[PDB]
């Protein structure tokens, strides 16, 4: 419930979760609010840590300011970032092809403290791209989405490795801070502790210790147990504090004698001077929590400390001693163990706010370098910060991040589901991350800290398995970028409701219960030995007093898309992966019927995807239309909601909306008011409910093809709408300027039956393949004339035709009406590339029926192409005369283990025909766990089984027993779920009963007409002479070396020689072949291919006397 | 002595001179293999050998000017050294010392990198090449066909067999010339199926 205009969808769920689903886009909106410094972010961070409420922009400016001379006599100070409102609204910005933006203001102050002379301005900083209500940016009119990234956090990382020979646990410390140097404290086969800082040699630890002010007596005094370290202190053979420092400097710096000031300053620069080393707030928190240095002190002084270094050394040496825990001096005890980099307490999530902050930092450093070098060249006490500031590198950095970066992906919107799940995506590659060749096999696996923080089912199935993954449902991102997860805090076997978010480290600390544990209706458990996850990913049995955390619900481990598959717990993970992957490739239909059986999480995933218009304040509808709704509020004010009628999506599908209310209703704040592309009454809907049957049918469904009735084509059950955009433009050439006219070279008035007075076609003119859309003719200049052409022109008496036609024509197999013609002109004060005068764009919108060659899929990944659309009459039918609509195959179910489709089909028939459990002698035995008001239901009523707590098989059989008859006394489907099918072609009944029922199948956007292309002879490459490739142009197919091997092994020499000489390379022989074909003569003998002549000329060019030999 | 005697006996059996290591006249690759193309819009593209050739031309002309002028040996031998380095950078850029780069600091692709590696004329044009008279589509089951048969969609086969159908429907006088045949095939008039 809790959404007021919801359809009544009964559920099978036995449990009752306490916590509703979060807002599914707070992985994006909260991050960008943190970057901006929103009021809502300000109050939320006030109630969660108000010691340092500071936005990211304020933080970068506080890091940068002040900027001063080398003499320190003047100062430049940055403060107070500020945003005004936007410059243009959303849809207008989308249509007029610019970027959604807002102006940026700071308070930059310059002081000359030679006598003290401040100058303060309010410097305009630039136009800043901003995020809409949904969570996307709009860049250059199109729509873009920034995908979050997984990097490993800076901090300490101990481990151990074994030796093949010495069998020694090589405990190695690594600190990998952000923008700093590296250092390690390593133990080799010898009893020696290196300090081999930044790819250097294993000096003794006492060398660094005496450099920092710890002589050998202090070392043995602090460490009375480190016998290995005092073995090094005898092995070190170098004593003295400054002697150690100069030894460090002369090992660090070749080419320079050891000078004390450089020895001091390079160590200070690499350790405490924050410029060339600064681990961030996250890394500082990581170290302060790992070694327990501070207690409740927040993040400040983000450089190193000798206390941290000596605590690190102590931790390493006690770990190699074999200590399990140790109190640091002045700090609490901590467990002592190794670290794994795949553990999810050590892979933070750099979201959109962090990425943009890094971009602005790397722009602002390049700006302030110019500022610091230019203040010297400017005069003294005669300049202003307006003269100082150059915001060009900042705005250039922003635009070169939004373009030209694989983390600013193109927005992928086939439907609301894919639009939602393109956000909440965690990548693993990119800049600052590892490439796919560097992706070792222990990063694509499923570490058992993923439970609740990343779904293990959903991933792209190509060469990207496990690199790209989605968020879980209930997850939430820390202020530092770690991934939290709710848990009920059960106290002493009584389950409370104080829901406590935890991270991976606390989850490793404590003991976690299981979601469906039998609580005794007040808090108490029932069985004493309950299931438990442990620290090491163990599954145990514990008495019910060490349990302190129970799960909030089941299905916490699963994604958004994979929480929509019904009966997921009966399916294998391969087919579940394919089902959740192809749930993001549906198409928006024209009727969009809601599914008969789904999970309850379909309403939330639609009203949170943002592609459904939602009323904001409760009120009464005043006037509806097809395009605008005027909701009248309670107090006077009114508000109109414009629609988007047939706008093109990013992949070529329509995005129509339509209202679903009347002129007198009362709506509440949050009620769905208008369906979107793939919605029906608010909830998601990607396909239709089609009657199915699972027998094999006469070979037309072999190796999982699919046959269909003709009723789908006739009733427009599966009929998408596609919208294609074609674009042409008029530049300026060397030989003049191109133009757009009705008049062309010598093509008749038949082709000018539709073109308007100034070029382009009229709106609504139905086109065919290859027709003229824009009439443009180019000045080709004048060339010389052949005498034969001169004679023919003298004979016929025509215009010289000194211009060449380049008209935009519709490519092959495209047709349908014309919606809109958008025209931009350089004369019309619009943004154009230089030389281009007029830019035009035509939208062609074919309505595409279902056809053979298209791809259909169920929800559990049982895809398949469409074999043969039979006519309606010779398609098998039940005893009532109803023909079935799609016949699957039965050899594809048992060998793939996805019987979720069979259970879904049985429940589909039960939910269609409706049931009533006969409670004459009370409730029957299977219906004990069944709720009230699932005992009976009307025909064509919907149900919902959730994912991991669904309907049991006993409940399915019990529902199938009682399935009230259609119109007469007729139970068409008996107790087994099967039915008695006649045969429409022959006429006799099938001898054995056959499973029927109501499946739910979608239509996939890999239609045939996108894919089919051929090429007889078309364009060609320039530097080489192979034909072009791609289906936008003609394109020819690549003939790989495996196919060369196939032809050689067959023995057809002539076909291979023909395919490698005259169809691809021999430019003087291709036209001879073409004319021999056209005239009708024999095909001539092939010549020498051009690749061989290229190779021959190269070998002659490299001073190699290459010669051929005849005899 | 054996390791030298390999190449020594090779030169012994050869009638070839051992003078091939020195060089007096670098050959020039023909200009179509290093195209001076331009785009629609005044943008000009070369293939990076022209820079190396231009460099060798400049060094050679300067050395000829200095040797007719008469100069001290420091100047003359420094010029000889940079000429020799330029020729080496032309033949194999990146072997000795450092590769010569340009804009964006990519090293210039020399002559040998048109054969070396996976982008030369021994692999990258000898794996495979795209062909004409091709096409591809998705496949469905044809369970009434005989074994040697296969289906074909007409909008593909018409494109595939286009010159054959041009010749045949000129020979049946449905279009008196080849351009008329091509326009008839493009407009897909209904006679082309019975010809096809």
């Amino acid at each position: 419930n809790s959404v007021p205009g919801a359809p009544n969808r009964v559920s099978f769920a036995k449990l009752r979760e306490p916590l509703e689903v979060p807002g599914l886009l707070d992985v994006q909106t909260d991050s960008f609010e943190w970057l901006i410094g929103s009021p809502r972010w300000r109050e939320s961070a006030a109630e969660r840590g108000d010691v340092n409420p500071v936005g990211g922009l304020e933080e970068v400016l506080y890091e940068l300011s002040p900027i001063e001379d080398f003499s320190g006599s003047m100062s430049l100070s940055f403060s107070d970032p500020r945003f005004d409102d936007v410059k243009a609204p959303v849809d207008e910005c989308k249509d007029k092809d610019m970027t959604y933006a807002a102006p940026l203001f700071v308070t930059a102050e310059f002081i000359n403290n030679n006598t003290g002379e401040i100058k303060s301005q309010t410097v305009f900083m630039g136009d800043f791209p901003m995020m809409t209500e949904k969570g996307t940016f709009i860049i250059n009119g199109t729509e873009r989405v920034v995908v979050s990234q997984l990097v490993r956090s800076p901090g300490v990382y101990f481990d151990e490795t074994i030796d093949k020979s010495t069998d020694k646990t090589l405990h190695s410390v690594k600190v990998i801070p952000s923008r700093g140097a590296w250092l390690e404290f390593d133990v080799d086969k010898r009893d020696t502790v290196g300090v081999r800082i930044d790819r250097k040699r294993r000096q003794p630890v006492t060398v660094l210790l005496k450099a920092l002010g710890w002589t050998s007596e202090q070392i043995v005094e602090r460490f009375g147990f480190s016998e290995i370290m005092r073995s090094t202190l005898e092995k070190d053979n170098t004593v003295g504090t400054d002697e150690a420092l100069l030894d460090i400097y002369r090992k660090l710096r070749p080419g320079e004698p050891p000078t004390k000031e450089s020895a001091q300053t390079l160590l200070e620069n690499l350790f405490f001077k924050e410029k060339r080393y600064d681990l961030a707030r996250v890394g500082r928190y990581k170290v302060n929590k790992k070694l327990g240095l501070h207690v409740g002190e927040p993040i400040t002084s983000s450089t190193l400390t000798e206390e941290d270094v000596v605590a690190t050394i102590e931790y390493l040496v006690r770990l190699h001693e074999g200590q399990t825990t140790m109190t640091v001096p002045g700090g609490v005890e901590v467990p002592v163990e190794t670290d794994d980099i795949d553990h999810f307490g050590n892979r933070r999530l750099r979201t959109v706010g962090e990425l943009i902050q890094n971009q602005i930092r790397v722009g602002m450093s390049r700006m302030e370098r110019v500022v610091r070098e230019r203040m010297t060249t400017q005069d003294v006490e005669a300049i202003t910060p307006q003269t100082l500031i150059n915001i060009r590198p900042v705005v250039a950095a922003i635009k070169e991040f939004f373009g030209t970066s694989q983390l600013s992906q193109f927005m992928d919107q086939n439907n609301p589901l894919s639009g939602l799940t393109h956000k909440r995506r965690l990548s693993a590659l990119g800049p600052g991350g590892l490439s796919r060749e560097r992706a070792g096999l222990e990063v694509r696996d499923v570490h058992p800290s993923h439970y609740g923080r990343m779904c293990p089912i959903e991933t792209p199935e190509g060469p990207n398995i496990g690199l790209i993954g989605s968020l879980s449902v209930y997850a939430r991102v820390n202020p530092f970028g770690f991934i939290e997860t709710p848990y009920r805090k059960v106290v002493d076997g009584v389950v409370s409701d104080e829901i406590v978010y935890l991270t991976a480290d606390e989850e490793d600390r404590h003991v976690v219960a299981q979601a469906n544990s039998p609580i005794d209706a007040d808090g108490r458990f029932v069985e004493p030995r309950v299931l438990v996850r442990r620290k090491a990913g163990e599954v145990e049995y514990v008495p019910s007093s060490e349990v302190d955390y129970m799960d909030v619900s089941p299905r916490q481990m699963v994604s958004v898309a994979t929480a929509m598959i019904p009966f997921l717990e009966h399916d294998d993970a391969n087919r579940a992966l394919m089902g959740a992957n192809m749930q993001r490739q549906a198409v928006p239909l024209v009727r969009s019927e809601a599914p008969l059986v789904g999970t309850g999480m379909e309403l939330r995933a639609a009203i949170d995807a943002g592609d459904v218009v939602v009323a904001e304040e409760s009120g009464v509808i005043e006037e509806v239309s097809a395009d605008y709704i005027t909701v009248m509020h309670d107090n006077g004010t009114r508000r109109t909601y414009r629609m988007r009628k047939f706008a093109r999506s990013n992949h070529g599908t329509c995005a129509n909306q339509c209202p679903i209310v009347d002129a007198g209703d009362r709506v509440e704040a949050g009620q769905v008011i208008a369906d979107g592309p793939c919605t029906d009454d608010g909830e998601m809907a990607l396909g239709k409910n089609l009657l199915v049957a699972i027998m094999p049918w006469e070979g037309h469904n072999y190796e999982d093809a699919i046959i269909l009735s003709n009723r789908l084509v006739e009733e427009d059950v599966l009929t998408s709408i596609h919208i294609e955009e074609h674009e042409i433009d008029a530049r300026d050439t060397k030989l003049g300027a191109e133009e757009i006219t009705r008049d062309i070279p010598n093509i008749s008035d038949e082709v000018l039956a539709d073109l308007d007075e100034r070029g382009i076609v009229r709106i609504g003119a139905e086109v065919r393949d290859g027709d003229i859309l824009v009439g443009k003719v180019t000045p080709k200049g004048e060339t010389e004339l052949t005498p034969e052409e001169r004679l023919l022109r003298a004979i016929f008496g025509e215009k010289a035709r000194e211009v060449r036609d380049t008209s935009l024509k519709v490519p092959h197999g495209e047709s349908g009406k014309v919606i809109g013609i958008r025209v931009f002109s350089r004369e019309d004060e619009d943004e154009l590339p230089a030389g281009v005068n007029e830019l035009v764009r035509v939208y062609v919108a074919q309505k595409r029926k279902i056809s053979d060659g298209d791809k259909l899929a169920g929800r559990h990944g049982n895809k398949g192409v469409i074999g043969k659309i039979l006519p309606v009459e010779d398609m098998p039918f039940l005893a009532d005369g109803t023909p079935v609509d799609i016949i699957l195959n039965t050899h594809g179910v048992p060998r793939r283990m996805n019987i979720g489709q069979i259970l879904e089909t049985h429940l589909g028939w039960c939910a269609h025909s409706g049931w009533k459990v006969d409670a004459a002698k009370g409730v029957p035995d299977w219906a004990a766990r069944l709720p009230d008001e699932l005992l009976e239901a009307q025909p064509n009523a919907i149900v919902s089984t959730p994912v991991f707590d669904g309907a049991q098989e006993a409940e399915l059989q019990g529902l199938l027993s009682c399935t009230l008859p259609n119109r007469d006394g007729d139970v068409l489907v008996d107790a087994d779920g099967k039915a008695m099918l006649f045969d429409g072609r022959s006429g006799e009944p099938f001898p054995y009963p056959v499973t029927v029922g109501y499946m739910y199948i979608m239509k996939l956007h890999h239609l045939v007409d996108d894919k089919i292309h051929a090429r007889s002879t078309g364009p060609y490459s320039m530097i080489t002479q192979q034909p072009l490739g791609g289906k936008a142009q003609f394109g020819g197919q690549r003939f790989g070396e495996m196919e060369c091997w196939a032809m050689q092994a067959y023995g057809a020499a002539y076909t291979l020689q023909e395919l490698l000489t005259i169809k691809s390379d021999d430019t003087v022989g291709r036209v001879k072949v073409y004319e021999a074909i056209v005239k009708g003569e024999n095909i001539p003998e092939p010549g020498i291919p051009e690749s061989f002549k290229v190779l021959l000329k190269e070998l002659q060019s490299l001073c190699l006397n290459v010669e051929v030999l005849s005899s | 002595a054996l390791k030298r005697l390999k190449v020594v006996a090779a030169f012994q059996q050869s009638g070839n001179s051992p003078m091939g290591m020195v060089l007096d006249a670098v050959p020039v690759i023909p200009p179509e293999l290093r195209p001076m193309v331009q785009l629609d819009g005044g943008r000009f593209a070369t293939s990076d050998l022209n820079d190396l050739y231009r460099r060798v031309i400049n060094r050679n002309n300067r050395l000829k000017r200095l040797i007719d002028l008469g100069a001290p040996e420091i100047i003359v031998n420094n010029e000889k050294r940079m000429l020799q380095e330029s020729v080496d950078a032309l033949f194999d850029n990146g072997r000795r010392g450092r590769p010569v780069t340009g804009p964006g600091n990519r090293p210039l692709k020399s002559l040998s990198d048109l054969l070396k590696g996976k982008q030369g004329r021994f692999r990258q044009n000898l794996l495979g090449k795209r062909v004409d008279y091709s096409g591809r589509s998705v496949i469905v089951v044809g369970p009434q066909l005989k074994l040697h048969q296969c289906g074909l969609p007409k909008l593909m086969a018409l494109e595939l067999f286009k010159p054959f159908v041009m010749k045949r429907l000129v020979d049946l006088n449905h279009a008196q010339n080849i351009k008329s045949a091509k326009r008839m095939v493009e407009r897909q008039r209904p006679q082309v199926w019975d010809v096809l």
């Binding site: 080799d188 010898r190 020696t192 040699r201 294993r202 | 050294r81 380095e85 010392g97 450092r98």
Partner: peptide, 22 residues
């Protein structure tokens, strides 16, 4: 004092050759 030989041996021959261009 465990690993210096190979790194120093490679480094000296690397720094000898590359500093003698023209």
């Amino acid at each position: 004092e465990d690993e210096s030989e190979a790194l120093r041996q490679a480094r000296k021959d690397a720094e000898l050759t590359a500093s003698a261009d023209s």
